[PDB]
Amino acid sequence: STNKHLKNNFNSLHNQMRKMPVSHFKEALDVPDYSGMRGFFAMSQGFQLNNHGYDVFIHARRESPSQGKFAGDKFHISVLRDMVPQAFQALSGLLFSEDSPVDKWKVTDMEKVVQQARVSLGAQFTLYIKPDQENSQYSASFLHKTRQFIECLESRLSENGVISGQCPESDVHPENWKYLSYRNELRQRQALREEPFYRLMTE
Q: The domain spanning residue 153 has which CATH number?
A: 3.30.2430.10
With respect to residue 133, please indicate whether it lies within any of the assigned structural domains.
Answer: yes
CB atoms inside a 10 Å sphere around CB 139:
14
Q: Cα angle vertex 66, ends 190, 188, to 5°?
A: 10
Whether residue 29 is contained in a domain is answered as: no
Helix axes 10-17, 140-159, angle to 10 degrees: 60
Nearest-angstrom CA–CA distance, 81 and 110: 8
Type of residue found at 98 = E
Residues found in the chain: 203
- Domain contains 32: no
Domain that holds residue 97: 1-16+39-203
| Enzyme catalytic residues | 76, 106
User: How was this structure obtained?
Assistant: X-ray
Tell whether 113 is covered by a domain: yes
Query: Cβ of 137: how many Cβ atoms within 10 Å?
Result: 18
Residue 26 falls inside a structural domain: no
The secondary structure element, H or E, covering residue 77 is strand 73-77
Stated in angstroms to one decimal place, the resolution of this structure is 2.3
In a domain, residue 10? The reply is: yes
Query: Which of 100, 120, 121 minimizes the C-alpha distance to 109?
Result: 120
Buried b (16+ CB within 10 A) or exposed e, 85-117: ebbbebbbbbbbbeebbbbbbbbbbbebbeeee
Number of domains in the chain: 1
